[PDB]
Amino acid sequence: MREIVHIQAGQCGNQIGAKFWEVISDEHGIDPTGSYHGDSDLQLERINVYYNEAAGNKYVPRAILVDLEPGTMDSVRSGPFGQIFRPDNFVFGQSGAGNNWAKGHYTEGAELVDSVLDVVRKESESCDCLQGFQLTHSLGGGTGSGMGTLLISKIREEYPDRIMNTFSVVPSPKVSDTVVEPYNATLSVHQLVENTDETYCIDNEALYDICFRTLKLTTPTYGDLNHLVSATMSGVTTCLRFPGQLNADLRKLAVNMVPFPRLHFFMPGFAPLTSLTVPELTQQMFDAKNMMAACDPRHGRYLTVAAVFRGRMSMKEVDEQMLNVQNKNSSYFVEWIPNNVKTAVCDIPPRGLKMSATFIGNSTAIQELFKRISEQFTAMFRRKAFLHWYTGEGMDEMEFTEAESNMNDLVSEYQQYQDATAD
Amino acid sequence: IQKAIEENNNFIKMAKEKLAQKMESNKENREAHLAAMLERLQEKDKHAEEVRKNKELKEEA
Amino acid sequence: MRECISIHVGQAGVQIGNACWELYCLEHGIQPDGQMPSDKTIGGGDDSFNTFFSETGAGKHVPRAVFVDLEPTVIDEVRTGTYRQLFHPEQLITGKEDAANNYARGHYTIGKEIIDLVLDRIRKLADQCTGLQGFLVFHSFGGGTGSGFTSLLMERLSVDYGKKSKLEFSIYPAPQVSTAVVEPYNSILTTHTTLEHSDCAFMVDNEAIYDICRRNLDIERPTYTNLNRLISQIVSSITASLRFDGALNVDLTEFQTNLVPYPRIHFPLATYAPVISAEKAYHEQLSVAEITNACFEPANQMVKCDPRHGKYMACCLLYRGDVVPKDVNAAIATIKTKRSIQFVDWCPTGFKVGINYQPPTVVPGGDLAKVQRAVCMLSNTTAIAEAWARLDHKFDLMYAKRAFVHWYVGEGMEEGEFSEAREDMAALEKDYEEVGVDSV
Numbered sequence: 001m002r003e004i005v006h007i008q009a010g011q012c013g014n015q016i017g018a019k020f021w022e023v024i025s026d027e028h029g030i031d032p033t034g035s036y037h038g039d040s041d042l043q044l045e046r047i048n049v050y051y052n053e054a055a056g057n058k059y060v061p062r063a064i065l066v067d068l069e070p071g072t073m074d075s076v077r078s079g080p081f082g083q084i085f086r087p088d089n090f091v092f093g094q095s096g097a098g099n100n101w102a103k104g105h106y107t108e109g110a111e112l113v114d115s116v117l118d119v120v121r122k123e124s125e126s127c128d129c130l131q132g133f134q135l136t137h138s139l140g141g142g143t144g145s146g147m148g149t150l151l152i153s154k155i156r157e158e159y160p161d162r163i164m165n166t167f168s169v170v171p172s173p174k175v176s177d178t179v180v181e182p183y184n185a186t187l188s189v190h191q192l193v194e195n196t197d198e199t200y201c202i203d204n205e206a207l208y209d210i211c212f213r214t215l216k217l218t219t220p221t222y223g224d225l226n227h228l229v230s231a232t233m234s235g236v237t238t239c240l241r242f243p244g245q246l247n248a249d250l251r252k253l254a255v256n257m258v259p260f261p262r263l264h265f266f267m268p269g270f271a272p273l274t275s276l277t278v279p280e281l282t283q284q285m286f287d288a289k290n291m292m293a294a295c296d297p298r299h300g301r302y303l304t305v306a307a308v309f310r311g312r313m314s315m316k317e318v319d320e321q322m323l324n325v326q327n328k329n330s331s332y333f334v335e336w337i338p339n340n341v342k343t344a345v346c347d348i349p350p351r352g353l354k355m356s357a358t359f360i361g362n363s364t365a366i367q368e369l370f371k372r373i374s375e376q377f378t379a380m381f382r383r384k385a386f387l388h389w390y391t392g393e394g395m396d397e398m399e400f401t402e403a404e405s406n407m408n409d410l411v412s413e414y415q416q417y418q419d420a421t422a423d
Numbered sequence: 424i425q426k427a428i429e430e431n432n433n434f435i436k437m438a439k440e441k442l443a444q445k446m447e448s449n450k451e452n453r454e455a456h457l458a459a460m461l462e463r464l465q466e467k468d469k470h471a472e473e474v475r476k477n478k479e480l481k482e483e484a
Numbered sequence: 485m486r487e488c489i490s491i492h493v494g495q496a497g498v499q500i501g502n503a504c505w506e507l508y509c510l511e512h513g514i515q516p517d518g519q520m521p522s523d524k525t526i527g528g529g530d531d532s533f534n535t536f537f538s539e540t541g542a543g544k545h546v547p548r549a550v551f552v553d554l555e556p557t558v559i560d561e562v563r564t565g566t567y568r569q570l571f572h573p574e575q576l577i578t579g580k581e582d583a584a585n586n587y588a589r590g591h592y593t594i595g596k597e598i599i600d601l602v603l604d605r606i607r608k609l610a611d612q613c614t615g616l617q618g619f620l621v622f623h624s625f626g627g628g629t630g631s632g633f634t635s636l637l638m639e640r641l642s643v644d645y646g647k648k649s650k651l652e653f654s655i656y657p658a659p660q661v662s663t664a665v666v667e668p669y670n671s672i673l674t675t676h677t678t679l680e681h682s683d684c685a686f687m688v689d690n691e692a693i694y695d696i697c698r699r700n701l702d703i704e705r706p707t708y709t710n711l712n713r714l715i716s717q718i719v720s721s722i723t724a725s726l727r728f729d730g731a732l733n734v735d736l737t738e739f740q741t742n743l744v745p746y747p748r749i750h751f752p753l754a755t756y757a758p759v760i761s762a763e764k765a766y767h768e769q770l771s772v773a774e775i776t777n778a779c780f781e782p783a784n785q786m787v788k789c790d791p792r793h794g795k796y797m798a799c800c801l802l803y804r805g806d807v808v809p810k811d812v813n814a815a816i817a818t819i820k821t822k823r824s825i826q827f828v829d830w831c832p833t834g835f836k837v838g839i840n841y842q843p844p845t846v847v848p849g850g851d852l853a854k855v856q857r858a859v860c861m862l863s864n865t866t867a868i869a870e871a872w873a874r875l876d877h878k879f880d881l882m883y884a885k886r887a888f889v890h891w892y893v894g895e896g897m898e899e900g901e902f903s904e905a906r907e908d909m910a911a912l913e914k915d916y917e918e919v920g921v922d923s924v
């Protein structure tokens with residue numbers, strides 16, 4: 001009865017969103033046609049969270065597919081599980097955004113946003129009790145970045161008392177040659193600092209370092225990067241998709257993870273990263289090499305942390321090992337938030353893995369990522385490079401200054417609580 | 424016995440009032456929060472309509 | 485006559501209510517369908533068990549209880565579980581979205597929409613009573629519903645039923661099962677708001693219950709089912725005086741007179757024995773003296789604290805089963821000569837004793853062994869303030885940085901309510917210190 005509405009915008013948003021629906025569809029036993037072919041009733045106890053039950057025992061994702069280019073719309077429609085999405089939930093423009101935030105946020109995206117809100121509204125009205133929304137998108141492009149933040153603001157207008165979370169792919173030179181990505185990212189964060197409850201920072205720099213250094217994959221493709229993303233998104237959503245003894249809804253989880261409204265940018269983590277004992281999984285999942293955000297947790301302090309374990313394991317051993325890591329690493333947990341580490345266990349493991357672990361961390365070390373983006377931003381803005389693309393769409397240059405100062409403020413705020421003490 | 428009745432009634436009176444007071448102030452506070460949230464978003468839409476209008480003047484050049 | 489209405493609020497309250505009413509049915513020989521063959525007075529009666537059960541003309545024995553939660557998944561398990569038939573549908577009340585571990589949502593935002601319905605359903609039970617005694621409220625401190633809505637309910641019950649008595653069974657948060665950083669905030673807020681509206685509150689520390697299950701039942705990792713079934717035994721011992729009768733049975737109200745010297749000092753410490761697995765219990769029957777000694781081993785307390793480093797204001801022993809006064813008095817004599825039991829100078833040192841002859845019952849397939857005699861000690865000790873201190877310390881650590889406070893302010897609360905509640909706890913901690921000082 002706690003339905004979530006899924007939205008995917010832009011090139012990156014639509015691809016990682018497809019991976020998400022492919023993985024969880026397999027986990028819930030749903031085939032490309034929408035028929036259930038499962039062995040246990042536990043697959044269906046929370047199927048409504050992400051699926052509508054239609055006539056004929058068919059399950060349809062509660063998802064809307066959005067982009068300013070029609071190319072991706074056919075690509076999604078033809079890939080695996082292409083025809084299971086509601087066809088009228090595909091919303092398209094003609095021109096595109098050309099990796100320009102202003103086009104997605106102010107001009108071309110504004111032209112298409114209303115039609116998107118129509119499909120959102122009709123999906124939400126058919127919810128017994130809507131809990132919130134999740135968005136998949138990148139921050140380096142134009143559609144997912146610009147229009148994605150616009151859509152969030154419009155949804156926050158009509159549904160101000162619903163949770164709005166995002167899976168945001170952060171840009172990195174190691175994966176993209178486009179140069180104006182720091183501009184788009186900084187402009188997106190300026191919006192996300194205000195209009196989201198939880199933002200999982202999926203950093204392409206970290207995904208590359210993982211695929212190249214750890215997984216030993218020379219020349220990584222987008223498919224290699226997203227396979228990590230699907231594993232993480234599956235693990236994060238396991239708390240809601242499966243019936244553990246945790247009676248948690250998006251709001252309850254946010255209440256436990258967000259001590260301050262602006263500090264809601266999480267470091268994802270996964271283990272094992274290969275292609276295992278509970279102590280090894282716990283030690284690996286707290287390692288800097290296993291983080292999906294290019295940050296070292298030993299360079300900061302944890303405000304809150306959540307560890308999700310999947311598989312058949314000793315719940316006693318999990319409790320002992322989680323207490324071990326805290327005791328042996330007490331310096332990296334703020335002492336003014338007692339018992340700030342949560343643990344969930346799901347008996348159902350992901351596909352082709354006897355045991356996995358997903359890590360959600362609200363660490364002040366996330367500043368390292370924002371500092372990186374801020375550096376690339378200022379390198380250009382002090383040089384006024386490529387500004388004509390944005391002012392040509394009606395933007396003033398201080399709008400760049402405001403977003404820059406707001407991100408530097410966010411970094412300093414992370415530093416203030418990192419330096420804070422109890423007595 | 425009159426005093427006993429007086430005390431039971433006052434305890435009920437004080438409780439009824441203080442509760443009503445709390446849940447009127449709370450209604451006011453939550454409304455003032457969402458009213459400010461929407462007014463911020465509506466102020467964004469003005470700056471949005473202004474950005475669209477600023478592009479429309481220079482394309483006339 | 486002298487009926488009691490039980491109110492179960494939130495997940496903890498509801499699930500503990502499930503275990504309690506399951507145990508009551510077994511102790512009284514009531515079947516899951518509500519039929520009780522031994523009751524020959526059909527559709528009514530003034531038996532002792534009628535204080536907790538009403539009767540229908542069809543012979544069904546219906547708990548005088550109300551279950552309430554702001555989300556339906558937990559009460560839904562009752563609506564489809566073994567004892568669905570026991571309760572009339574109107575006794576099971578559910579909202580649609582919970583309080584998300586936020587006291588404000590349970591007290592203001594979400595609680596506001598359902599409070600009137602609950603009171604009306606409670607009124608329907610009260611109108612069935614010839615001489616209603618009071619209320620038993622089961623809830624947690626940490627949950628948003630268990631804390632916020634309970635506070636709202638207690639406030640509204642004081643208005644609709646004047647000073648009619650209200651007893652609490654409160655779940656004190658323990659990190660071993662507490663999955664919420666904000667539970668200290670909710671705990672202080674609700675303790676402050678209910679303090680003037682509660683006559684007697686029995687606090688249960690999940691850590692204490694957790695350790696007892698691990699230590700005495702050899703359960704590597706107990707579940708809520710393990711904890712609740714044990715909690716039911718303590719609840720049953722406390723309520724056995726109201727549900728059974730006899731020549732040595734002392735009413736709980738008579739114990740309450742001794743346990744509350746000041747209105748604010750109404751938090752008794754409960755200790756229970758024996759908790760023993762069937763493997764150990766075999767060929768090892770415990771005596772009256774052995775279980776009485778266990779009542780003074782702190783490892784058997786419902787709340788972690790040190791009575792040895794505090795002072796007593798009252799000591800009550802509630803025996804049930806094969807117990808006679810002679811053995812009780814002998815055991816008490818030995819204990820007085822061996823253990824650190826210091827009373828405040830302004831109250832007598834005697835022990836108030838009660839005995840129920842109906843022996844303890846255990847749930848089929850449980851971990852507790854069936855025993856011939858058991859005891860629950862209720863003591864007013866200053867040491868209980870240690871629980872307030874630990875909780876207040878955690879509150880201070882987060883509130884100094886206003887951590888998570890925005891979630892409460894966003895639902896309409898003011899910072900002043902936080903400081904107001906914390907100050908009340910500071911006075912409460914000081915009150916306990918005062919009562920323990922020697923006179924002049």
Ligand SMILES: Nc1nc2c(ncn2[C@@H]2O[C@H](COP(=O)(O)OP(=O)(O)OP(=O)(O)O)[C@@H](O)[C@H]2O)c(=O)[nH]1
Pocket residue numbers: 009010011012013015016068069096097098099100138139140141142143144145169170171172175176181204222223225226
């Ligand atoms: N990991 C991963 N990243 C992707 C993928 N596709 C695009 N990206 C990222 O997307 C960013 C660029 O944005 P776009 O791909 O243009 O997406 P967009 O925001 O919709 O921008 P436009 O549609 O072109 O206006 C780059 O930093 C890429 O790394 C993908 O398949 N996998």
Ligand SMILES: Nc1nc2c(ncn2[C@@H]2O[C@H](COP(=O)(O)OP(=O)(O)OP(=O)(O)O)[C@@H](O)[C@H]2O)c(=O)[nH]1
Pocket residue numbers: 247493494495496499500554582583584585586624626627628629630631655656657658661662663664667690708709711712
């Ligand atoms: N002893 C015991 N405690 C429980 C049980 N279930 C939950 N709790 C306690 O309740 C707290 C978690 O909050 P909930 O009980 O779920 O909150 P709620 O009263 O259901 O209301 P919400 O905030 O909406 O969830 C923790 O501190 C738990 O220790 C239970 O079955 N037995």
Ligand SMILES: COc1cccc(-c2cc(NCc3ccc4[nH]ccc4c3)nc(N)n2)c1
Pocket residue numbers: 133134165166198236237238239240246248250252253254256257306307308342343344360663664
């Ligand atoms: C963005 O959309 C979604 C969709 C589905 C889930 C989530 C999500 C998952 C999650 N998993 C670990 C966790 C965290 C805090 C906890 N507290 C008690 C148990 C517990 C477990 N944590 C958060 N915050 N969100 C977010």
Ligand SMILES: [Ca+2]
Pocket residue numbers: 175220221222
């Ligand atoms: Ca590439």
Ligand SMILES: [Ca+2]
Pocket residue numbers: 523525526528529530531534539
């Ligand atoms: Ca009868």
Ligand SMILES: [Cl-]
Pocket residue numbers: 160161162163251
């Ligand atoms: Cl909200």
Ligand SMILES: [Mg+2]
Pocket residue numbers: 010011069096143
């Ligand atoms: Mg594109």
Ligand SMILES: [Mg+2]
Pocket residue numbers: 247494495553555582627629
């Ligand atoms: Mg609940």
